[PDB]
Scaffold this motif. Structure first.
Motif, PDB file in Angstrom:
ATOM      1  N   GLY A  65       1.121  -1.192   0.245  1.00 10.31           N
ATOM      2  CA  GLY A  65      -0.405   0.126  -0.158  1.00 10.31           C
ATOM      3  C   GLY A  65       1.000   1.104  -0.129  1.00 10.31           C
ATOM      4  O   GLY A  65       1.350   1.681   0.501  1.00 10.31           O
ATOM      5  N   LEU A  66       1.454   1.704  -1.286  1.00 12.47           N
ATOM      6  CA  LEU A  66       1.975   2.892  -1.360  1.00 12.47           C
ATOM      7  C   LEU A  66       1.405   4.055  -2.352  1.00 12.47           C
ATOM      8  O   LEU A  66       1.919   2.972  -3.551  1.00 12.47           O
ATOM      9  CB  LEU A  66       3.250   2.396  -1.159  1.00 12.47           C
ATOM     10  CG  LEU A  66       4.297   3.456  -1.630  1.00 12.47           C
ATOM     11  CD1 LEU A  66       4.170   4.689  -0.566  1.00 12.47           C
ATOM     12  CD2 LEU A  66       5.308   2.665  -1.067  1.00 12.47           C
ATOM     13  N   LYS A  67       1.496   4.550  -2.470  1.00 10.52           N
ATOM     14  CA  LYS A  67       1.093   5.720  -3.667  1.00 10.52           C
ATOM     15  C   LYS A  67       2.455   6.390  -4.583  1.00 10.52           C
ATOM     16  O   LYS A  67       3.379   6.795  -5.781  1.00 10.52           O
ATOM     17  CB  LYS A  67      -0.146   6.404  -3.847  1.00 10.52           C
ATOM     18  CG  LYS A  67      -1.432   5.650  -3.179  1.00 10.52           C
ATOM     19  CD  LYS A  67      -1.554   4.627  -4.445  1.00 10.52           C
ATOM     20  CE  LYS A  67      -2.776   5.219  -5.338  1.00 10.52           C
ATOM     21  NZ  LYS A  67      -3.789   5.232  -5.352  1.00 10.52           N
ATOM     22  N   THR A  68       2.813   7.183  -3.482  1.00 15.44           N
ATOM     23  CA  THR A  68       3.646   8.718  -3.938  1.00 15.44           C
ATOM     24  C   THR A  68       4.970   8.374  -3.058  1.00 15.44           C
ATOM     25  O   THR A  68       5.030   7.867  -2.413  1.00 15.44           O
ATOM     26  CB  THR A  68       3.648  10.225  -3.578  1.00 15.44           C
ATOM     27  OG1 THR A  68       3.009   9.846  -2.267  1.00 15.44           O
ATOM     28  CG2 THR A  68       1.982  10.128  -3.978  1.00 15.44           C
ATOM     29  N   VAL A  69       5.939   8.149  -4.357  1.00 15.42           N
ATOM     30  CA  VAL A  69       7.218   8.323  -4.104  1.00 15.42           C
ATOM     31  C   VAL A  69       8.734   8.773  -4.434  1.00 15.42           C
ATOM     32  O   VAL A  69       8.433   9.959  -5.402  1.00 15.42           O
ATOM     33  CB  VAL A  69       8.086   6.412  -4.079  1.00 15.42           C
ATOM     34  CG1 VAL A  69       7.005   5.309  -3.234  1.00 15.42           C
ATOM     35  CG2 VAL A  69       7.955   6.865  -6.143  1.00 15.42           C
ATOM     36  N   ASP A  70       9.682   9.432  -3.398  1.00 18.48           N
ATOM     37  CA  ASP A  70      10.750  10.235  -4.214  1.00 18.48           C
ATOM     38  C   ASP A  70      12.059   8.968  -4.176  1.00 18.48           C
ATOM     39  O   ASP A  70      11.928   8.778  -3.351  1.00 18.48           O
ATOM     40  CB  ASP A  70      11.203  11.244  -2.897  1.00 18.48           C
ATOM     41  CG  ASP A  70      10.763  10.852  -1.678  1.00 18.48           C
ATOM     42  OD1 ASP A  70      11.674   9.688  -1.200  1.00 18.48           O
ATOM     43  OD2 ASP A  70      10.628  10.808  -0.671  1.00 18.48           O
ATOM     44  N   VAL A  71      12.537  10.349  -4.803  1.00 19.57           N
ATOM     45  CA  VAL A  71      14.000   8.790  -6.025  1.00 19.57           C
ATOM     46  C   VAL A  71      14.763   9.450  -5.185  1.00 19.57           C
ATOM     47  O   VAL A  71      15.739  10.477  -5.453  1.00 19.57           O
ATOM     48  CB  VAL A  71      13.556   8.039  -6.696  1.00 19.57           C
ATOM     49  CG1 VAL A  71      15.181   7.129  -7.947  1.00 19.57           C
ATOM     50  CG2 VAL A  71      11.731   7.230  -7.044  1.00 19.57           C
ATOM     51  N   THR A  72      15.598   8.362  -4.447  1.00 21.61           N
ATOM     52  CA  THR A  72      17.563   9.187  -4.530  1.00 21.61           C
ATOM     53  C   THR A  72      18.353   7.958  -5.668  1.00 21.61           C
ATOM     54  O   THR A  72      18.512   6.534  -5.436  1.00 21.61           O
ATOM     55  CB  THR A  72      17.873   8.996  -2.925  1.00 21.61           C
ATOM     56  OG1 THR A  72      17.470   7.406  -2.871  1.00 21.61           O
ATOM     57  CG2 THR A  72      16.787  10.176  -1.724  1.00 21.61           C
ATOM     58  N   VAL A  73      18.610   9.113  -6.034  1.00 22.67           N
ATOM     59  CA  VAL A  73      19.772   8.059  -7.126  1.00 22.67           C
ATOM     60  C   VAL A  73      21.300   8.265  -6.983  1.00 22.67           C
ATOM     61  O   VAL A  73      22.114   9.384  -6.534  1.00 22.67           O
ATOM     62  CB  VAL A  73      20.037   8.669  -8.525  1.00 22.67           C
ATOM     63  CG1 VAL A  73      20.846   7.946  -9.672  1.00 22.67           C
ATOM     64  CG2 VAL A  73      18.476   8.924  -9.220  1.00 22.67           C
ATOM     65  N   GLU A  93       3.874   7.007  -7.927  1.00 24.77           N
ATOM     66  CA  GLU A  93       3.643   8.200  -8.567  1.00 24.77           C
ATOM     67  C   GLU A  93       5.414   9.100  -8.008  1.00 24.77           C
ATOM     68  O   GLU A  93       5.692   9.396  -6.978  1.00 24.77           O
ATOM     69  CB  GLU A  93       2.679   9.351  -7.600  1.00 24.77           C
ATOM     70  CG  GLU A  93       3.465  10.434  -8.156  1.00 24.77           C
ATOM     71  CD  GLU A  93       3.308  10.915  -9.330  1.00 24.77           C
ATOM     72  OE1 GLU A  93       3.692  10.661 -10.147  1.00 24.77           O
ATOM     73  OE2 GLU A  93       3.361  12.454  -9.516  1.00 24.77           O
ATOM     74  N   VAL A  94       6.545   9.114  -9.019  1.00 25.45           N
ATOM     75  CA  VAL A  94       7.748   9.448  -9.094  1.00 25.45           C
ATOM     76  C   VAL A  94       7.172  11.437  -8.035  1.00 25.45           C
ATOM     77  O   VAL A  94       7.514  11.764  -9.462  1.00 25.45           O
ATOM     78  CB  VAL A  94       8.280   9.249  -9.771  1.00 25.45           C
ATOM     79  CG1 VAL A  94      10.199  10.135  -9.961  1.00 25.45           C
ATOM     80  CG2 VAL A  94       8.665   7.198 -10.123  1.00 25.45           C
ATOM     81  N   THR A  95       7.389  11.430  -7.186  1.00 25.10           N
ATOM     82  CA  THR A  95       7.512  13.367  -6.531  1.00 25.10           C
ATOM     83  C   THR A  95       8.904  13.962  -6.796  1.00 25.10           C
ATOM     84  O   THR A  95       8.622  14.857  -7.766  1.00 25.10           O
ATOM     85  CB  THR A  95       6.880  13.126  -5.850  1.00 25.10           C
ATOM     86  OG1 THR A  95       7.549  12.761  -4.396  1.00 25.10           O
ATOM     87  CG2 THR A  95       5.489  12.388  -4.953  1.00 25.10           C
ATOM     88  N   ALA A  96       9.727  13.327  -6.295  1.00 25.36           N
ATOM     89  CA  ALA A  96      10.914  13.956  -6.960  1.00 25.36           C
ATOM     90  C   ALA A  96      12.027  12.836  -6.968  1.00 25.36           C
ATOM     91  O   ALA A  96      11.544  12.189  -7.120  1.00 25.36           O
ATOM     92  CB  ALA A  96      11.625  14.882  -5.885  1.00 25.36           C
TER      93      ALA A  96
END
Length: 116
Positions: A65-73, A93-96
């Motif tokens: 259960g998870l919709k929005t996520v922020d990515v760290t490369v 949803e890749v927010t940032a």
RNA sequence: GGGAGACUUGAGUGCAGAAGAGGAGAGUGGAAUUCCAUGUGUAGCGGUGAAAUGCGUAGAUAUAUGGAGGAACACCAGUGGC
């Protein structure tokens, strides 16, 4: 047990790509890796393997259960953009997106060159 | 060349300014690495031309918060300076 916002860490080296989806506080939720998808050797470094690892990790995270996520490369790996697009396609949803490749301010001496 | 003078261009001093990773001593800042502690979390991680040794279910890698300590000073940075 149920989450809404979280973090997705994309650690992509020259050998392997690992995708770790945690809460926004960093508590691990799910993770996957080209090694955990059966890829071996050079294949683990290919952009395709990064895509697949991102896909599987996204499925489990959204299943939790998870919709929005922020990515760290992180890391100089090649599969970064493939993994990012895999997340989006699988639904999250890749927010940032931010690049967190550690950059020593000189600091520790690196290992020697190869073939010398 | 010697001896007795004179001179200010070389040399130095005075006066007024300029730049600098010059040296020495005492402090001190941040990134990063490693280790240590604690959460989350699960089966890999790491590595090569390809592999294996190795680390990991005695819970690793990752990840988040901290702690310790050591060494070197990213960007500036430039046939730039001293």
């Amino acid at each position: 047990k149920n989450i809404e916002s979280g973090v997705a860490h994309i650690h992509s080296t020259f050998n392997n790509t690992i995708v770790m989806i945690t809460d926004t506080h960093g508590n691990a939720l799910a993770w996957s890796s080209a090694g955990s998808l059966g890829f071996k050797g050079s294949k683990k470094s290919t952009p395709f393997a990064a895509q697949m690892a991102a896909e599987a990790a996204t499925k489990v995270a959204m299943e939790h259960g998870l919709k929005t996520v922020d990515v760290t490369v992180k890391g100089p790996g090649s599969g970064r953009e493939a993994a990012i697009r895999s997340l989006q396609a699988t639904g999250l949803e890749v927010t940032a997106i931010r690049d967190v490749t550690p950059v020593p301010h000189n600091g520790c001496r690196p290992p020697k060159r190869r073939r010398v």
